[PDB]
């Protein structure tokens, strides 16, 4: 699976990718990472994908086996780094699948690259409303050089939920081990400001100039008043589905790969059949 890793200048930055490289028909499956992570949170869900879909999944800048301190930037910088990777790949047809934060890159990326290009999107457990006060303070502990370990062992937490789960603790604990206060200030100050500036991701994406289908897939939080906020939306909307995934983490493509494909296969199939 690092088989399929490798780097690319795009303008200034070398970044790394996942591209599988296979010859079919598209789609291809652009799988995008949230903030401070890379594409070892995707390795399981590439296995389910790896057969039939072409599979690309860019890491951000200062993102990778190897992190670095990079300049300041934000989603929409995000957006056109996957876009010129997709142009050096000669992809035409994407559909995009995000990890939670992520999210801000696939919306934004539907508005961009538009409904031929990006006909549809997935975003994996995404908080769907505007930050409640145990998030807002992570994001504030996040920001701040004295408390930022801190600030992710909380939001670990929240991530775990209580359970022992094996690969996402791997994840967590040894995967992101090596990322440091450039990479979860930023992802501090982007977010709290995607929020701030476009309400939520909701707001965001009932604003898309080309609404189109969009699911999202989740397993938390896994209370009853943040379904209903999701069934809501989607009565409200004929474009939004979304689908309770009942894992045990923040991370279904980790927890319950098998899920997760089935839900991009269906879109992915959805977009072959016009």
């Known amino acids: 699976t690092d088989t399929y890793l490798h780097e690319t200048l795009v303008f200034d930055n070398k970044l790394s990718y996942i591209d599988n490289q296979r010859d079919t028909d598209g789609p291809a499956i652009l799988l995008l990472p949230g903030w401070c992570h890379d594409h070892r ?12 879909f072409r599979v690309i999944v860019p890491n951000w800048r200062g993102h990778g086996l190897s992190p670095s301190e990079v300049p300041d930037f934000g989603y929409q910088e995000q957006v056109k780094d996957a876009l010129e990777i997709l142009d050096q790949l000669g ?39 505007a930050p409640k006060p145990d998030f807002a303070k992570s994001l504030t502990l996040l920001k701040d050089p004295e408390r930022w370990r801190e600030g992710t062992h909380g939001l670990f937490d929240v991530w775990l939920d209580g359970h022992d789960e094996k690969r996402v603790r791997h994840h967590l604990l040894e995967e992101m081990a090596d990322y440091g206060y450039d990479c979860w200030g930023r992802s501090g100050r982007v977010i709290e400001d995607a929020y701030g500036r476009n309400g939520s991701p909701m707001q965001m994406m009932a604003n898309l100039t080309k609404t189109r289908p969009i699911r999202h897939i989740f397993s938390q ?15 409200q909307h004929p474009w939004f589905s979304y689908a309770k995934l009942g894992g045990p983490t923040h ?7 098998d899920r997760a494909a089935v839900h991009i296969r269906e879109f ?3 977009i072959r059949q016009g």
């Open 41 to 52: 949170v995707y390795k399981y869900l590439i296995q389910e994908l790896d057969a039939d």
């Open 91 to 129: 992809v035409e047809t994407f559909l995009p699948v995000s990890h939670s934060h992520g999210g801000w890159v696939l919306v934004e990326l539907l508005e961009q690259a538009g409904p031929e290009r990006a006909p549809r999107g997935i975003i994996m457990d995404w908080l769907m409303w």
């Open 221 to 235: 939080p896994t209370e009853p008043e943040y379904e209903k906020i999701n069934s809501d939306f989607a009565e």
């Open 251 to 257: 991370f279904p493509a980790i927890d319950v790969p």
């Open 268 to 270: 992915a199939t959805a």
